[PDB]
Amino acid sequence: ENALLRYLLDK
Amino acid sequence: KPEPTDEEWELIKTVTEAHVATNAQGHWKQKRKFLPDLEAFSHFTKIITPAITRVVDFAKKLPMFCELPCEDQIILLKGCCMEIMSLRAAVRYDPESETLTLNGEMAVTRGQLKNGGLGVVSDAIFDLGMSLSSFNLDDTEVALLQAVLLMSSDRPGLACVERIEKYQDSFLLAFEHYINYRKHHVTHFWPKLLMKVTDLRMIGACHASRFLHMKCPTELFPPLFLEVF
Numbered sequence: 510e511n512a513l514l515r516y517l518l519d520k
Numbered sequence: 521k522p523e524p525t526d527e528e529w530e531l532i533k534t535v536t537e538a539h540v541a542t543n544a545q546g547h548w549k550q551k552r553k554f555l556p557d558l559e560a561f562s563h564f565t566k567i568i569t570p571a572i573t574r575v576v577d578f579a580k581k582l583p584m585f586c587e588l589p590c591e592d593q594i595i596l597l598k599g600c601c602m603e604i605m606s607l608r609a610a611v612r613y614d615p616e617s618e619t620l621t622l623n624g625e626m627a628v629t630r631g632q633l634k635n636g637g638l639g640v641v642s643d644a645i646f647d648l649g650m651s652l653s654s655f656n657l658d659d660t661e662v663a664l665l666q667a668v669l670l671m672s673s674d675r676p677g678l679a680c681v682e683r684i685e686k687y688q689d690s691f692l693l694a695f696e697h698y699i700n701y702r703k704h705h706v707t708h709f710w711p712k713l714l715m716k717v718t719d720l721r722m723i724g725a726c727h728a729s730r731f732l733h734m735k736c737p738t739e740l741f742p743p744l745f746l747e748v749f
């Protein structure tokens with residue numbers, strides 16, 4: 510759930 | 521009329537620098553290439569992923585954004601991508617070719633975007649760009665509009681609602697105080713810019729309603745595009 514968007518949010 | 525305070529100038533340096541660092545090209549007009557219904561719609565959805573990423577990059581360069589929990593960051597970014605990407609294209613309207621520029625490289629016509637799935641929203645983005653000509657928005661004004669849309673407390677599921685609303689109120693003063701200082705030769709420039717924020721907010725909601733419409737297998741759509749809607 511929003512895992513790429515989360516990966517990019519954290520560096 | 522009140523002009524930017526010393527701390528408001530720092531906030532303007534910061535948010536302006538964020539914007540310029542994450543804005544495609546900036547030449548965008550001379551690296552521009554003109555383009556000559558799930559087949560125009562591939563070759564657009566394909567070009568979104570870098571544009572969404574540039575928005576994430578803007579938000580991550582804003583120290584106020586980075587103080588929020590990532591649940592709230594995800595929520596904020598999900599609500600302001602299409603707004604920011606729409607503003608970023610509308611400020612790149614060429615009155616003579618009657619095109620918008622995406623990724624600072626591809627010139628598109630009103631028809632091309634409506635044909636690529638934007639539907640009525642492409643009419644809204646072009647109309648905005650046309651009206652943003654007489655406004656003569658600079659990089660600081662665009663960056664501050666972007667920060668105002670990002671720090672929307674109204675977005676559903678947020679935790680730090682009042683912290684976000686405080687960040688947004690900091691940008692709105694700095695932006696108004698900058699507006700007072702830039703002395704634009706338009707009457708009631710602030711009231712009219714505030715109406716434009718609302719035009720953009722309407723673009724972000726209509727686009728996010730045409731998504732729920734196309735469900736056309738989801739895997740034909742880029743991964744980032746699906747996480748933002």
Ligand SMILES: COc1nc(C(=O)NCC(=O)O)c(O)c2ccc(Oc3c(C)cc(C(=O)c4ccccc4)cc3C)cc12
Pocket residue numbers: 542543544561564565567568571574604605606607608609621622623624633636637638639641645727728730731732734749
């Ligand atoms: C203004 O929008 C955009 N702005 C910029 C841009 O200027 N970037 C900023 C900068 O210059 O730095 C872009 O690069 C864009 C690239 C692709 C794009 O593609 C879309 C999108 C996103 C949504 C729809 C739908 O309506 C829809 C259809 C089905 C389901 C849901 C939604 C259709 C298309 C073609 C829209 C872009």
